[PDB]
Design a binder for these strands. Structure first.
Lengths: 198, 101, 169, 125, 355, 103, 200, 271
RNA sequence: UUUUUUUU
RNA sequence: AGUCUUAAACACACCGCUCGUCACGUAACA
RNA sequence: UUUUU
RNA sequence: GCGAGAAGGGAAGUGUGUUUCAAAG
RNA sequence: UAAUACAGGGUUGAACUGUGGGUUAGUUUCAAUGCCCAAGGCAGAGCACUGGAUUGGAUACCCAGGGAACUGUGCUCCCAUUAAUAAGAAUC
RNA sequence: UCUUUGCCUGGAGGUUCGUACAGUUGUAGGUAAAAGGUAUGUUAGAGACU
RNA sequence: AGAGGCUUGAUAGUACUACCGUAAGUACAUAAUAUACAGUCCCAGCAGUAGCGGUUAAACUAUAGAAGAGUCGAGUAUUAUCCAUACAUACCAGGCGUAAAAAGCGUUCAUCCAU
RNA sequence: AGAUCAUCGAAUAUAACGG
RNA sequence: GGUACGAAGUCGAAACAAGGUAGUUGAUGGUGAACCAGUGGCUGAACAAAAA
RNA sequence: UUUUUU
RNA sequence: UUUUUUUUUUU
C-alpha cells in the first residue's frame, strides 16, 4: 500500500521481537559483561604503568585512543589495578581471600568462564564518542515528556505552517564552593529566580 | 433500564470487511497459507456496495392525484382491458389511463 | 523515604541509568561552524552525544551583552539596493566564471559579505573564454557579460543585480 | 447555546445520508472546524434548517463517539497549563471557544490563551 | 447564562428585535434572484440515459469465457498428521480444515451447572464457556452445553472457532484512546500502557489478555455484575469493547491529515513516486531526449554515483594500514586467522580434553 | 476558605474577576428612594463551588448616598465604598448613573 | 447525568440526600466508642440456640458500667461466673445466640481462672507457657539414622584414613554387628553450641 | 505493623493444590527456584572418575552455554550480509533521476554528513561492485586545474597512465567528459561497513529454533515460567531467607533416610 | 592453583 | 382413560403451601 | 562469651 | 535603673480567621 | 344525549400583531364514594336487626320483612388519585 | 443530545381560641433474603377431542 | 531451632517509585508430606453471609500426631476508631414500566432556561 | 480599608414601629 | 392496650385455582379466631359470548 | 577425615 | 558495596 524501504518504520522498529504467541516461548540470551574486565589482564598492567609514569604525556584521553577505550572505562582499570597490587606488596591479604559483596563474586566467575570458552580480548572494541542513532533504550525514549503526547497531529497544507511554541528551560537552585578550610567549609546558595544580582 | 440509549451502543458501528481484506490479514498472520486464487482478486477488487444504497430515496407518487381528474372528465377508460389481470377498478403500464397521465 | 532494590530472581544484572531528553526547541536551528546540530532521533540516552556537546559548549561563550502601498515598496527597494552596492566602491548557487576572469569575480565574492551575509553564492569552473554569467535558482540569468573605470563598473552591476531579486523590503 | 447541543443527536447516525439541523449563528461556525479535519463531507443552509451530510468509510461512520462538556446551565473553563493534562496521549478533537473566534484544542495551547471546552469528537474516557 | 434582572435591562440592543426583517440566505430567496435576471431560463430536469449498446455489445464477450462444452453443458443439460506427536486427529468434524489448529489457544472461564425437572426426578446438565482466539489479531467466545463437564468443554470450544472475528489493532502496539464497555451493571475500562512495559492485569485472567493480541494494556473489571452470577453478562462485554478501537491507518485514511507516530517519520503518508522518477530508459532512445531536455547545469547532489550493486564479500576490519599502531596489527592478525579456520573454529566439542 | 490549589483553577479566577472592580466598586439597581438623599442599591455578586463546579448568584442589598438625588427607583447605578460610617444606614456614595427610567 | 444539579439551590438539595447508614460497627454501639468496657453479671442462664442448631449454649446477662444490660457469651470449656461477678466484655457477634453481640475476656477479667485443657490456642485462652512445655522445645537430637547406603560408602573411601574420637584411628566398620561412628564436627552442631554456651 | 499475609497466599510459579500435584499445601514457596526458568552457561562435573590418574576429564559443556557467549566472527554471516546489501540499495540503483533525487534517497538509507561516520556508499571517491564496467565520476573535479595539469604531466601520464583505460567501456557515469579526467593514478579502492544492517544479521542467531482436545490449553504456569515481570516480588527478610537454606542442609538428608528405613526394614523381615 | 566448589 | 390449550404464591411439587384467637417463657421503648 | 584449625 | 501573663481556652456566629490593597507620629 | 337561552373549546379563510415564551410558593379554583349538619318523604333497591334451614359439627352463601345511607351554591380530598409510567425542544 | 419542577434508598417496628392551633419516614428488642421475570415439570370439582 | 505468636475445610492473585525476558544458593550432597492416625457422638464445640458435628467427615480436643506441611519475626495477634477499599457519599460516577421512586387535573410570584 | 456558601439537634413563624 | 424473639399445645380452614360460590382498597356497621354485609373506584378478572 | 576440580 | 577523598547515580 505504501513504499518506504528503510529501517526506522513502525513495523521495523524493535526488530527480532516476539509479536504473538512466541512471547511466552523461553529463549536464551547472551550474558552481558563490562568492557573493563574482558580485556587481557596483561594489557591492564601495561596501561596502568603508563598512567602512573607520566600523566602529562600519557593523558586519560590519549591513552584510551590507541587501545580503543572510553574515557570512563580506562579510569576504572587504573583504580581496580592499584588496589590489587597494594595488598600484595604490603603482604596484607590475597586477592582471592578479599571480602566483597556477592554481586562482584558472580561477576568474577563470568569473567573466568568468558575466557575459558572464547578467550581474553587483546584490544578493546568500542567507540570513544557516542553517535546519534535510532535505537530502543527503555520505555522512556519513545515518549515526549514536554508536551505529554504520543501521537502528533498537524494540518496538511503546502503553504508554510506556523511553527509551534518552543519550551523554556527549567530554573532550579544549585550550590557552589567559595572558601574551603580544614576546619570549615563555606558555600554559596544560588537563586536564579532573583532579579537583583548584587 | 435496558436499551435506553438511542444514540449509543444500540446502533453498532462494526467495520465491513470484504474477502480481500480478511484474507490479507490471515495470510500475513501465518494462520492460513496463500491460496492460488488470492492474486486473482487482488488486481480486481470488488466494488463497494454499502455506499451505493445510501443514495436510495423515496419520492411522492403524483399519479394518485393526477389520475383522479382524468377519469372524472373521461370515465370511459375502465372498459378497455377489463378481463386482463392486474387491472383494478373496485392499472398496468399498458392501460390507457397510465399512458395519458 | 525509600530504597528501591530488586526482590526477585534477577538480583544481579546490568541496570543502566536512563535520562529522557526531548527536543530542546522545535524551531529550525542552523549549523554551527558548518557542523550540523539538528536533532536526528528522539531517543537519547543519559550520556551526552558529541553533536549536542557542541551546541551547549558555544552557549556559555555567548555573553549576555548585546498613493498606494505597492508603489512605496518598489521605491525603497531600488534606493536601498543602489546605496548598498555603492559602499563597496569609491542567495543562489550556480555562478559560473572563466579562468581569466577570476580577478573580476574574486572581488565581487568578498564584497557581498559586507552588506548581505545571507548570500551563499558558489563557484563553478568552465572552459576559459571570457565568460561571466550569474544564474538564479530557477534557471534565469541576472548578469550576462559580453583606465580602471571599466573594471569597477563591471563589478558594480553584479553586486546590485543579486540584491535586486533577493532583498525584501 | 441550547441549539448547539442539539446537533450531536442528528450527526450521530449510522443508517443515514443527510440530516437536518436548526439554523443558528454559532452552529454554522462549528461545522467549519469539523470539515477541515475531514469529519463532515459538507453542509448547506436550507433556510430555517441546515442540511448536513454524513461521511462513511467501510460501512461504519467516521464519527463514533460524541461527548458534550459545556452545557447551558454551567460553563467549563481550563487554563492553558491545565488543558494539556486533560488532553494527553489521545487523538481526540476538542472544540475550544477563545476570544479570537473558535479554534481546536491544538491551536489553543499554541497561543497560550484560556479557551472554553465546548464538545468532544472521537474521544474515549 | 445568568439571565438575571440586571442582565436583562442591559443586553437589549434595541427596544424592538425585528426578526422577520433579518437577512438570512434561504432556498427560495436565491431561486428568485436567478429568475429575475431572465427578461420576460427556468428550472429543468434530466432523465436517465438508457442505452442498449452498453450491455448488448458487451455481453457477448463474457460468453467466450464459458462457451466451452465442458463448462456449459453440465449446467444447462478424514485425518491430519501432527508430525511431532504422530497421532490421528479428526480433521473436519464440522470445522474448517483450511484453518490451522496448531496455532490457537484456549482458556477455560467457568463450568456452570444447571438443573432440569422431569416427571420422575431431577436432571442435571453441565455447561462451559471457552474462549478461543489467536494471540496476534484474533479473538472469540463460544458457549455450548453437554452432559458431563469434559464433554461440555469440548462443545463450547467448537462454537468459539466458528465465531472468530477480526480486530482493529495498531501496528505499533499502541492504542489511541481508552475504550469503555457496558451491558447491564458492568464496566470494563482498558487503560493503555507505555511501549516496552508489558501487560498488567489479574493473574487469573492473565492468559486471556495474551489471547487477545493486545499489548501494553491494563485490563480491569469494575464489578462485572452486582446481582446473581457474573459470567453470562461478561461474555457480551468483550464483543462491544474491542469494536470501538481504531488504528492509525483508519483515522488517517478518513482524516486526510498528519496522523504519524513519534518514533517513525512519515511511514504511511510518504509515497515516493516510484513509477515516474525510476522510469526505465534504454540506450536506443536516450540520444533523442538529450537535445530536447534542459541541459544539466546545477549543483545540489554530491552522492550521485551508484548502479546495480553486486553482492561481494569484503573484510574492512582486517585491512592493514600505514597508520595503525604495531599492537593493533598483531591483534588483528591472530583474530583473522581464528575466523578463517574450518577445522577447529567451526566445530562443537562437549568435553574439554580430547576424550 | 479556599485551598492553595483552589486559587489557580480557571473557574475560581473567572468568578473573582467578575466580582472585582476598580476601587472595590459595585453594580446594582435602586429599589427604594423614599428617604431624602437616600437610595438602596441592590447589588448582585457571584461565588464558586468546588464540589459540583457551578456558580450561583445571590443579591446583596445595600444603602447608598446621593447629593443631587438624580437617581430614581429602578435605575442601575454605581456605588463606591468608604472608610467610615455616616448615618444609621448610609454606607456608600454615588458616582454616576448609567441608565434612567422614564419618570 | 446532571439532572440533579439544576436550580440555584443545588448546594443545599443534593448534599442532603444521604445514601445509607453505616453497616459496619452497627451491633457494638453501647461501648460509647471504647475498645472495652467493664461490667458486672447479675443473671446466669442457658439459652437454647435457634434451629437447626441443637445443643445448649451458656450465656450470662452482664451489666455494663454505663448502666446498660446486654447478654454476653462465655466461649471455652468450663464455667466459673456466678451472681455479682465482674467480667470484662469485648466485641463479637454470635449467630447461634440471637441478640448477643458481645464476648467475655479470660484472664484480664476478675475472678475468671484460666482454661482447663488447651495447648493449641495460647493467647486466646490466656494460658501461659508451662515450664514442662518449654523444656521440650529445647530437646533436638535425632540425627543418627544411618542406612545401608552409608555403610557401603563408608567402607569404600572413608575406611583407610579416618580418625575416631577417643584415641584411635583404625576401627572395625566392616563388621556387620558394629555401628559406624558419628561425625565429631558436624553432627549435633546446633545443640552442642547452645549447651556449651549456657554453662557459665 | 504488617505481619502475616491476609489473603489467598497463591504461589509464585502459579500451580494448583491437591493430590498428585507438585504442591500439596497452600503456600508461597518463594525458595523453589526449580520451577523458574534459568539459563545454564556454566559446566557440571561427574560424581566419580574411573580414571586412575587424577584428571579433569569429567568437565562437560552446557547446552545453553554455547549461545550464552557468542562471537560475531563466524563465517556464515558475511555471505548473507552481502546479499542483503544489494537488496537494500536497490531504490537508488534503479533511480534514473537527477543528482538531487538520488542524494536524498541515499541519505535516508544511511545517515551521513559532516561530523558523522558514513559508509561511503554512493560517493564519487569510492569503489563499488557494479554489474558492468564504468568510468569514474570525474564531474566534481575542477576544470581549470586539470587543463593546466594535462600539459605539464607529459605523455607518460596523459595516454598510458589513466586515459589508456578511461574509455575502454561503453557505459559511463554522470554522462561523459573526455576533456576532464584524473591524470594521476590514484586508486579509489576500499569501502566501509554499515552500522544498521550489519547489527541486525548478527543478532539473528539469538532467536533461532531447532481423547485430546482440539485446541491446546494455556496454563498460567507457562506465562510466569519464562517471563519474570509478572512475578510477585519477595517480602521476607534476607536473614530468614538465608537461614532457610542452612536448615535444609541437615534436614533434607534425614528425610530421605527416614523414608527408606521403613521400606528396607519391612522387606528384610516380611518379604 | 588461592585452606576453589563448600554452607554458625 | 390418553392428549391439546390456559392459570398458578407449589418445585422433598396438593400427604403441597399458608393465616388467626387463646395458654407458658425471655426482653427494649417504661 | 571465646577465637589464625 | 531596666525586663517580666513567656504556667492564660473564661467571652463571641456572621464573629473569630483567610484573601486583595494601603500606611513619610 | 331532539327543541330554546347564556357563555367556552377545537378545524379552515382574510386582516392585524412583529419574540409575545418553557417550569412554577409564603398562592388560588374544581374534584367519585363514605361521615357530621341541614333539606327532606307517599316509586325501584337494602346494612344493622330471631324469621325457616343446615353440614362429614357448627352459620351471614340460597328466599322474604327491614325507621341509616341515594338530588346539597355548605363543611371537605383519606384511596387502586379520573385518558397509560415525562410538563418542554431537536432527528421522520 | 438540552432547560426546569417534584420524590426514594434491603425487608421491618413504637405506652395505658389551651382535651385548642401548628407539625411528624427516621435516636430500638430483632433478621440475611424480600422480590420482577424466560423456560421446564406438577396440580387443577377449568375448556375441547381420537 | 541463634526464637516466639498465628493458619492447618472451600473462597481471596498474594503491590505499586530504579530495572521491566538481555539472567545462577545453575549441578552433587538432597528429597519428603497431614483429605495417615488418636478421643466424644445433635451431646461437649467451632466459625466469616452461606455452615460442620447421628452410620466417624482434612470443619470439635490433641503434635514424644515425626527433626509440622505454610506466612511473619525480636515481635505477633484481638478489639476499637475514620470520607470504612466502585456496598461509588452518585458533577467525574446511581434512579423514577412491572421491582423502593413523578404531585389528581390547571392559570399566577421569585430564580433558572430561550433564537 | 473592601469582599468573603454556614452546619447539627425530626419539626412546630410572621415580629417590632406611628394614626 | 399494643409490638419483638424462642418453643410449642388447643380451637378454625381465610389466601392459592370460579370450590370460602372474585377480591384488594377509601369511609362506616357487626362478629371469640380466617374477618363478614352494603356503596364508590381498580384489575392485581375467571366463565360465557353476533353475519342478510 | 570424604568427592570433584585452569 | 570506592586503600591513600571529606568527591562518586557504587549495584
Amino acid at each position: 500500500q505504501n513504499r518506504f524501504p528503510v529501517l526506522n518504520t513502525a513495523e521495523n522498529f524493535r526488530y527480532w521481537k516476539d509479536r504473538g504467541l512466541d512471547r511466552l516461548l523461553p529463549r536464551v540470551f547472551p550474558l552481558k559483561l563490562p568492557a573493563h574486565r574482558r580485556v587481557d589482564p596483561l594489557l591492564r598492567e601495561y596501561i596502568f604503568f603508563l598512567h602512573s609514569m607520566d600523566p602529562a604525556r600519557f593523558s586519560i584521553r590519549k591513552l584510551g585512543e590507541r587501545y580503543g577505550l572510553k574515557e570512563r572505562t580506562v579510569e576504572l582499570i587504573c583504580r581496580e589495578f592499584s588496589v590489587a597490587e597494594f595488598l600484595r606488596r604490603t603482604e596484607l591479604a590475597t586477592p582471592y581471600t578479599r571480602r566483597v559483596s556477592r554481586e562482584k563474586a558472580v561477576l568474577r566467575m563470568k569473567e573466568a568462564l568468558f575466557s575459558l570458552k572464547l578467550g581474553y580480548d587483546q584490544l578493546g572494541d568500542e567507540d570513544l564518542d557516542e553517535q546519534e542513532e535510532h535505537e530502543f533504550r527503555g520505555f522512556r525514549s519513545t515518549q515526549d515528556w514536554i508536551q505529554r503526547q504520543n501521537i502528533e497531529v498537524e494540518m496538511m497544507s503546502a503553504f508554510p505552517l506556523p511553527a509551534k511554541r518552543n519550551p523554556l528551560p527549567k530554573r532550579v537552585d544549585v550550590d557552589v564552593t567559595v572558601h574551603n578550610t580544614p576546619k570549615l567549609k563555606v558555600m554559596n546558595w544560588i537563586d536564579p529566580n532573583d532579579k537583583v544580582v548584587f | 433500564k435496558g436499551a435506553v440509549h438511542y444514540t449509543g451502543t444500540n446502533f453498532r458501528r462494526v467495520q465491513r470487511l470484504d474477502i480481500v481484506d480478511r484474507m490479507r490479514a490471515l495470510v500475513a498472520q501465518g494462520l492460513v497459507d496463500a491460496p492460488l486464487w488470492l492474486s486473482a482478486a487482488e488486481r480486481a477488487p470488488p466494488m463497494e456496495l454499502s455506499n451505493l444504497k445510501l443514495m436510495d430515496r423515496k419520492v411522492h407518487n403524483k399519479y394518485l392525484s393526477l389520475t383522479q381528474a382524468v377519469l372524472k372528465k373521461y370515465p370511459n377508460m375502465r372498459f378497455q382491458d377489463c378481463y386482463v389481470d392486474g387491472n383494478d377498478w373496485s392499472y398496468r403500464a399498458d392501460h390507457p389511463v397510465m399512458q395519458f397521465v | 523515604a525509600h530504597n528501591p532494590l530488586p526482590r526477585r530472581y534477577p538480583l544481579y544484572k546490568h541496570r543502566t541509568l536512563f535520562l529522557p531528553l526531548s527536543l530542546p526547541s522545535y524551531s529550525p536551528q542552523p549549523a554551527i561552524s558548518g557542523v550540523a546540530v539538528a536533532p536526528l532521533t528522539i531517543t537519547t540516552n543519559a550520556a551526552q552525544l558529541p553533536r549536542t556537546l557542541l551546541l551547549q559548549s558555544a552557549v556559555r561563550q555567548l555573553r549576555p551583552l548585546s498613493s498606494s502601498w505597492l508603489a512605496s515598496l518598489a521605491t525603497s527597494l531600488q534606493d536601498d539596493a543602489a546605496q548598498l552596492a555603492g559602499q563597496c566602491f569609491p542567495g543562489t548557487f550556480l555562478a559560473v566564471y572563466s579562468s581569466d576572469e577570476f580577478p573580476a569575480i574574486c572581488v565581487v565574492r568578498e564584497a557581498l559579505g559586507r552588506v548581505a551575509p545571507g548570500v551563499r553564492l558558489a563557484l563553478r569552473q568552465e572552459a576559459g573564454e571570457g565568460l561571466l554569467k550569474i544564474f538564479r535558482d530557477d534557471g534565469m540569468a541576472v548578469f550576462v557579460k559580453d583606465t580602471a573605470l571599466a573594471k569597477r563598473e563591471a563589478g558594480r552591476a553584479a553586486v546590485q543585480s543579486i540584491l535586486l531579486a533577493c532583498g525584501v523590503a | 447555546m441550547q441549539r448547539a447541543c442539539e446537533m450531536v443527536v442528528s450527526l450521530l447516525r449510522v443508517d443515514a445520508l443527510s440530516q437536518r439541523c436548526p439554523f443558528h449563528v454559532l452552529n454554522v461556525q462549528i461545522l467549519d472546524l469539523l470539515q477541515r479535519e475531514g469529519l463532515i463531507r459538507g453542509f448547506k443552509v436550507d433556510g430555517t434548517k441546515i442540511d448536513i451530510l454524513l461521511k462513511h468509510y467501510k460501512g461504519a461512520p467516521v464519527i463514533r463517539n460524541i461527548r458534550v462538556v459545556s452545557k447551558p446551565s454551567r460553563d467549563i473553563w481550563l487554563t492553558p497549563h491545565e488543558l494539556k493534562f486533560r488532553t494527553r496521549f489521545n487523538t481526540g478533537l476538542w472544540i475550544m471557544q477563545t476570544s479570537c473566534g473558535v479554534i481546536s484544542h491544538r491551536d489553543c495551547l499554541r497561543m497560550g490563551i484560556g479557551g472554553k471546552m465546548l464538545m468532544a469528537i472521537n474521544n474515549g474516557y | 447564562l445568568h439571565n438575571s434582572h440586571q442582565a436583562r435591562v442591559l443586553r437589549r440592543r434595541h427596544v424592538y428585535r425585528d426578526k422577520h426583517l433579518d437577512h438570512v440566505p434561504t432556498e427560495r430567496a436565491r431561486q428568485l434572484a436567478e429568475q429575475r435576471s431572465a427578461f420576460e431560463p427556468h428550472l429543468r430536469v434530466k432523465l436517465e440515459k438508457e442505452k442498449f449498446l452498453r450491455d448488448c455489445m458487451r455481453e457477448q464477450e463474457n460468453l467466450a469465457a464459458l462457451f466451452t462444452e465442458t463448462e456449459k453443458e453440465t449446467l444447462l443439460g478424514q485425518t491430519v498428521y501432527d508430525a511431532e506427536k504422530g497421532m490421528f486427529v479428526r480433521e473436519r468434524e464440522g470445522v474448517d480444515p483450511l484453518i490451522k489448529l496448531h496455532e490457537l489457544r484456549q482458556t477455560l472461564l467457568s463450568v456452570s451447572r444447571m438443573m432440569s425437572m422431569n416427571k420422575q426426578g431431577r436432571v442435571y446438565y453441565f455447561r462451559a464457556i471457552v474462549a478461543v482466539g489467536n494471540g496476534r489479531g484474533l479473538f472469540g467466545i463460544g458457549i455450548a452445553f453437554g452432559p458431563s463437564p469434559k464433554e461440555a468443554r469440548s462443545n463450547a470450544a467448537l462454537a468459539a472457532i466458528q465465531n472468530l472475528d477480526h480486530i482493529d489493532f495498531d501496528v505499533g502496539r499502541t492504542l489511541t484512546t481508552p475504550v469503555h464497555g457496558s451491558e447491564y451493571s458492568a464496566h470494563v475500562k482498558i487503560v493503555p500502557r507505555p511501549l516496552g512495559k508489558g501487560l498488567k492485569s489479574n493473574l487469573r485472567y492473565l492468559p486471556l489478555l495474551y489471547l487477545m493480541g493486545i499489548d501494553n494494556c491494563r485490563v480491569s473489571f469494575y464489578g462485572p455484575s452486582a446481582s446473581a452470577r457474573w459470567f453470562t453478562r461478561a461474555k457480551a462485554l468483550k464483543r462491544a469493547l474491542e469494536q470501538l478501537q481504531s488504528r492509525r491507518t483508519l483515522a488517517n485514511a478518513t482524516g486526510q491529515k498528519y496522523d504519524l507516530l513519534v518514533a517513525p517519520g512519515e511511514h504511511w503518508m510518504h509515497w515516493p513516486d516510484r513509477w515516474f522518477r525510476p522510469i526505465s530508459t534504454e540506450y536506443a532512445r536516450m540520444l533523442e531526449r538529450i537535445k530536447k531536455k534542459r541541459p544539466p547545469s546545477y549543483r545540489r547532489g554530491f552522492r550521485a554515483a551508484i548502479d546495480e550493486v553486486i553482492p561481494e564479500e569484503i573484510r574492512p576490519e582486517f585491512t592493514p594500514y600505514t597508520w595503525k599502531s604495531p599492537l593493533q596489527k598483531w591483534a588483528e592478525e591472530l583474530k583473522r586467522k581464528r575466523l578463517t579456520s574450518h577445522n577447529v573454529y567451526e566445530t562443537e566439542v562437549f568435553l574439554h580434553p580430547p576424550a | 476558605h479556599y485551598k492553595t490549589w483552589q486559587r489557580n483553577t480557571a473557574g475560581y479566577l473567572r468568578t473573582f474577576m467578575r466580582n472585582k472592580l476598580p476601587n472595590n466598586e459595585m453594580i446594582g439597581y435602586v429599589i427604594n428612594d423614599k428617604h431624602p438623599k437616600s437610595i438602596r442599591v441592590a447589588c448582585d455578586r457571584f461565588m464558586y463551588v468546588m464540589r459540583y463546579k457551578k456558580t450561583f448568584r445571590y443579591t446583596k442589598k445595600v444603602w447608598a448616598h446621593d447629593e443631587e438625588s438624580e437617581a430614581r427607583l429602578g435605575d442601575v447605578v454605581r456605588i463606591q465604598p468608604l472608610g467610615y460610617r455616616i448615618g444609621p444606614w448610609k454606607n456608600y456614595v454615588l458616582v454616576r448613573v448609567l441608565h434612567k427610567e422614564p419618570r | 447525568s446532571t439532572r440533579s444539579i439544576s436550580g440555584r439551590l443545588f448546594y443545599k438539595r443534593r448534599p442532603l440526600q444521604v445514601p445509607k447508614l453505616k453497616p459496619p460497627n452497627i451491633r457494638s454501639k453501647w461501648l460509647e466508642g471504647a475498645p472495652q468496657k467493664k461490667g458486672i453479671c447479675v443473671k446466669v442462664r442457658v439459652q437454647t440456640p435457634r434451629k437447626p442448631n441443637s445443643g445448649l449454649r451458656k450465656v450470662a446477662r452482664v451489666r455494663l458500667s454505663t448502666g446498660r444490660t446486654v447478654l454476653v457469651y462465655i466461649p471455652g470449656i468450663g464455667h466459673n461466673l456466678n451472681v455479682h461477678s465482674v467480667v470484662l466484655v469485648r466485641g463479637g457477634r454470635c449467630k447461634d445466640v440471637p441478640g448477643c453481640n458481645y464476648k467475655a475476656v479470660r484472664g484480664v477479667a476478675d475472678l475468671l481462672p484460666v482454661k482447663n485443657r488447651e495447648r493449641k490456642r495460647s493467647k486466646y485462652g490466656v494460658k501461659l507457657s508451662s515450664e514442662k512445655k518449654e523444656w521440650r522445645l529445647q530437646r533436638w537430637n535425632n540425627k543418627h539414622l544411618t542406612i545401608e547406603k552409608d555403610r557401603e560408602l563408608f567402607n569404600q573411601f572413608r575406611w583407610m584414613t579416618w580418625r575416631n574420637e577417643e584415641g584411635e584411628m583404625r576401627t572395625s566398620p566392616l563388621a556387620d554387628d558394629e555401628e559406624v561412628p558419628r561425625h565429631t564436627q558436624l553432627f549435633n552442631r546446633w545443640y552442642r553450641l547452645k549447651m556449651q554456651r549456657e554453662g557459665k | 505493623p504488617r505481619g502475616s499475609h491476609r489473603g489467598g497466599v497463591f504461589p509464585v510459579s502459579g500451580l494448583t493444590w491437591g493430590m498428585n500435584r507438585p504442591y500439596l499445601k497452600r503456600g508461597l514457596y518463594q525458595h523453589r527456584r526449580d520451577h523458574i526458568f534459568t539459563p545454564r552457561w556454566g559446566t557440571r562435573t561427574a560424581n566419580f572418575n574411573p580414571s586412575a590418574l587424577p584428571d579433569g576429564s569429567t568437565r562437560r559443556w552446557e547446552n545453553d552455554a554455547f549461545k550464552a557467549w557468542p562471537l560475531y566472527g563466524l563465517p556464515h554471516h558475511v555471505k548473507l550480509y552481502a546479499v542483503n546489501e544489494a537488496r537494500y540499495l536497490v531504490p537508488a540503483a534503479r533511480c534514473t533521476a537527477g543528482p538531487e533525487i538520488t542524494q536524498y534517497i541515499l541519505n535516508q538509507l544511511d545517515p551521513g554528513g559532516a561530523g558523522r561516520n558514513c559508509s561511503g556508499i554512493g560517493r564519487p571517491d569510492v569503489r563499488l561492485p557494479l554489474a558492468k564496467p564504468a568510468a569514474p565520476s570525474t564531474t566534481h573535479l575542477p576544470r581549470h586545474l586539470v587543463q593546466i595539469a594535462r600539459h605539464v604531466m607529459g605523455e607518460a601520464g596523459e595516454k598510458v597512465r589513466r586515459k589508456a583505460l578511461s574509455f575502454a567501456s561503453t557505459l559511463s557515469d554522470q554522462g561523459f567528459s573526455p576533456d576532464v579526467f584524473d591524470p594521476f593514478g590514484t586508486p579509489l579502492s576500499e569501502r566501509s561497513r554499515i552500522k544498521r544492517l550489519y547489527n541486525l544479521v548478527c543478532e539473528a542467531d539469538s532467536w533461532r529454533v531447532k481423547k485430546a482436545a482440539l485446541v491446546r490449553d494455556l496454563p498460567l504456569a507457562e506465562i510466569l515460567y519464562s517471563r519474570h515481570t509478572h512475578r510477585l516480588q519477595s517480602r521476607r527478610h534476607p536473614f530468614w531467607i538465608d537461614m532457610g537454606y542452612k536448615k535444609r542442609i541437615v534436614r533434607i538428608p534425614y528425610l530421605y533416610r527416614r523414608r527408606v528405613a521403613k521400606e528396607e526394614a519391612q522387606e528384610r523381615e516380611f518379604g
